[PDB]
Amino acid sequence: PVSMTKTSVDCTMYICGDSTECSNLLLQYGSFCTQLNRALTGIAVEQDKNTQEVFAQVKQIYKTPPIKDFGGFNFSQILPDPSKSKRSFIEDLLFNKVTKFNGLTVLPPLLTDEMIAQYTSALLAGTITSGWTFGAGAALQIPFAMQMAYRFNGIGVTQNVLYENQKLIANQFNSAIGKIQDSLSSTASALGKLQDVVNQNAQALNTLVKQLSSN
Amino acid sequence: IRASANLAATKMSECVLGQSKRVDFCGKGYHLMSFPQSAPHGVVFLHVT
Amino acid sequence: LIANQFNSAIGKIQDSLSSTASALGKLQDVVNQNAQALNTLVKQLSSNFGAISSVLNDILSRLDPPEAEVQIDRLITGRLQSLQTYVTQQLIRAAEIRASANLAATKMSECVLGQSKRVDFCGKGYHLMSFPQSAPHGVVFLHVTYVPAQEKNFTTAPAICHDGKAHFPREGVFVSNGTHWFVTQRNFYEPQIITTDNTFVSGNCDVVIGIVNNTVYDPLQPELDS
Amino acid sequence: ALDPLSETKCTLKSFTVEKGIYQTSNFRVQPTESIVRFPNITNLCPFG
Amino acid sequence: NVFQTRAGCLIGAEHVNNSYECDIPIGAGICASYQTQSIIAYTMSLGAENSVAYSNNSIAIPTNFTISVTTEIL
Numbered sequence A: 001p002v003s004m005t006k007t008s009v010d011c012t013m014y015i016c017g018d019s020t021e022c023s024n025l026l027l028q029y030g031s032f033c034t035q036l037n038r039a040l041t042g043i044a045v046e047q048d049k050n051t052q053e054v055f056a057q058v059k060q061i062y063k064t065p066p067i068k069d070f071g072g073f074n075f076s077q078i079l080p081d082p083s084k085s086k087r088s089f090i091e092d093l094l095f096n097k098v099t100k101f102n103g104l105t106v107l108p109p110l111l112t113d114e115m116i117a118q119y120t121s122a123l124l125a126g127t128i129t130s131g132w133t134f135g136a137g138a139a140l141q142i143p144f145a146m147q148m149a150y151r152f153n154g155i156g157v158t159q160n161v162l163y164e165n166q167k168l169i170a171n172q173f174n175s176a177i178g179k180i181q182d183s184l185s186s187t188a189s190a191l192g193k194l195q196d197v198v199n200q201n202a203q204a205l206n207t208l209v210k211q212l213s214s215n
Numbered sequence B: 001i002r003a004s005a006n007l008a009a010t011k012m013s014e015c016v017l018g019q020s021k022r023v024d025f026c027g028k029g030y031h032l033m034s035f036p037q038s039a040p041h042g043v044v045f046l047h048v049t
Numbered sequence C: 001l002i003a004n005q006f007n008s009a010i011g012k013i014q015d016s017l018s019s020t021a022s023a024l025g026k027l028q029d030v031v032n033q034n035a036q037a038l039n040t041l042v043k044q045l046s047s048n049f050g051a052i053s054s055v056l057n058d059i060l061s062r063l064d065p066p067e068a069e070v071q072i073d074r075l076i077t078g079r080l081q082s083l084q085t086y087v088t089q090q091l092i093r094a095a096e097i098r099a100s101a102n103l104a105a106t107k108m109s110e111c112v113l114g115q116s117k118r119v120d121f122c123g124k125g126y127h128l129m130s131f132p133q134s135a136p137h138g139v140v141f142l143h144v145t146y147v148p149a150q151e152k153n154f155t156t157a158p159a160i161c162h163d164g165k166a167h168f169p170r171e172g173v174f175v176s177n178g179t180h181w182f183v184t185q186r187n188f189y190e191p192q193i194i195t196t197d198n199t200f201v202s203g204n205c206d207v208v209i210g211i212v213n214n215t216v217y218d219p220l221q222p223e224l225d226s
Numbered sequence D: 001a002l003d004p005l006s007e008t009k010c011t012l013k014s015f016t017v018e019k020g021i022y023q024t025s026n027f028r029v030q031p032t033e034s035i036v037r038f039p040n041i042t043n044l045c046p047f048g
Numbered sequence E: 001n002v003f004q005t006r007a008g009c010l011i012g013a014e015h016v017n018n019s020y021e022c023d024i025p026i027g028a029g030i031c032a033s034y035q036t037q038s039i040i041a042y043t044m045s046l047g048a049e050n051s052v053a054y055s056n057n058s059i060a061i062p063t064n065f066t067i068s069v070t071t072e073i074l
Ligand SMILES: *[C@@H]1O[C@H](CO[C@@H]2O[C@@H](C)[C@@H](O)[C@@H](O)[C@@H]2O)[C@@H](O[C@@H]2O[C@H](CO)[C@@H](O[C@@H]3O[C@H](CO[C@H]4O[C@H](CO)[C@@H](O)[C@H](O)[C@@H]4O)[C@@H](O)[C@H](O[C@H]4O[C@H](CO)[C@@H](O)[C@H](O)[C@@H]4O)[C@@H]3O)[C@H](O)[C@H]2NC(C)=O)[C@H](O)[C@H]1NC(C)=O
Pocket: D047, D048
């Protein structure tokens, strides 16, 4: 999970909606609601800061070239689909596996879902063409068959393991991605964590609403 | 959530923008790379190990 | 050059700090939030909470104990509820600082006392080393980072054939300036003639993708001929 | 209640306000008529 | 001079076709700022777009560097 639903609550109308006689009595309780309304505001801003830090780690929005000659590596399921919201295939499944007049409003997030997908296109665009370098400085295009041979060099595996096994590893990685789709496609229990965040928040508000019925 | 975001922010920092050498930080095994994929109210990684 | 770049780099920190008061927003927020917390906490004493007056002494002067105890109770449950909120606010806020300190305690442990390899842990770029500096209720780091600057395109190939064997760079990657093939380290263009001491042999040409023909120099042959 | 700048000053309890977006009040349409309805009985009630 | 945004009905601001960095967040990717003067609202920039000249046989290797000093506060 990254961000909560940016809930916002109005103190007075939740408590004394459309009532002068009730709002006055609330005023004798001093700054209680100005505190509450402040705290939820503090949460609300932090949520956009959360999303800002998680995704917006890269300065320039990169784009992959039309050439997909990645030495056999097939990303087409994780790169954005130009033919749709420019979201990747695997992204869509994720969106699809996940699911009032009393002052309980929701503020929309600063970075919208289409906006996010641009970042996650860049981070993927820098990752495939440029390697790690686009984080430390100027993004340097690297042939992808090269880049693995650095990553294998990064876990104590000599370069020549990759190229002598380039074809197999490609198929394994390509096949690897596919099973993710089936795993994601088959079960909605894969996304329990994110679902849990929404359900708790839904319950919290749901509980919050019901208290209006109590004597 | 806030702590998870930083862990996420950390993960995409070391594990996407680089190749982390912290065992069991980018999934079981010797880490290679990872790709983020967006998600409603969260992020999803595909750690290639 | 590296000396001058670091010295000048230090100087700009002064100006950014000297001019921009908002460079220290984080610490200022900590004080401001607490200052807000206390002031709100103080102000509640003025609230009636339904009591006939918010001045505790006033009630006792005006009412006999049988009735004043009711009014006093009203103030008590209110103000006590106010401390409850304030104390609770502090605890959560304390933990937020607590993670910050531990993170700070961390950053001085890896980044200061050593050279972290966690990218973006020690500021943008490959990390070198860092300094702490004290500050009100917090610490400030001056991460010294290595960021490459000027690039040149080159044509590459993951391996080269000398006698049909595949050669690979022991450390670095192959490049060419168009007519001659060069191996160079990864983060600073520094060519060297490709020789046996730079590269190790593995397999043969018929498997590698993108391997290209070249000539690998042998240091030993001239010694033998001479 | 002078203008939306004055509202922000009143809410922030200050005469100076920084850059940003401030939640200050709540738009509410006011009622325009008064409707009073009861079933038409004409029988005077026999409390007598 | 009224702009309709996904977050609501924005009054007082000119809508602008260009993109800039966010100065005041509004919602739905809309960010406002005070510029020469009036209040403008626009679709916030994600930064300058930068394609990368990827290919299967091209390498981009720095020939010069910098040492920068970054201030980070906790
Ligand atoms: C219980 O009994 C009370 C006693 O009344 C008798 O018993 C009941 C059962 C009835 O049968 C009643 O008719 C009996 O007389 C009873 O108190 C009575 O309540 C009625 C209704 O509220 C009163 O009638 C009112 O009459 C006045 C007239 O006032 C002028 O004359 C009187 C005479 O004494 C002067 O004192 C005044 O100064 C005035 O000069 C009306 O003004 C009034 O308002 C409207 O009525 C007339 C038409 O009736 C309209 O034209 C006016 O414009 C007003 O719109 C009432 O009509 C009656 O006076 C009163 N009795 C006494 C002795 O005061 C009670 O209501 C019964 N029920 C209960 C308690 O539930």
